[PDB]
């Protein structure tokens, strides 16, 4: 495992914030899943069987704007 950081846009609300480590929490291959609305990305604690990649997207879906900006 390792974590990355989503850089995470659109968002400013405990609602959607809620949603979001929500969702991390109920896909696979996450271990921990910390949000902030004050640097406006997501934390999130992965091992393998899902990355980055599928992460973007959920965090997408939830109905905001949000990239891979870096490990952790
Ligand atoms: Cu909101």
Redesign the pocket.
Request: aromatic share 0%.
């Given at each position: 495992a390792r974590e990355v950081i989503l850089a995470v846009h659109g968002?400013?609300?405990s609602?959607?914030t809620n949603t979001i480590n929500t969702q991390l929490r109920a896909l696979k291959g996450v271990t921990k899943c910390d949000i902030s609305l004050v640097t406006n990305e997501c934390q999130v604690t992965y091992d393998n069987e899902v990355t980055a990649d599928s992460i973007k997207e959920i965090i997408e879906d939830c109905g905001f704007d949000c990239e891979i900006l870096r490990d952790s």
């Open positions: 968002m400013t609300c609602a959607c």
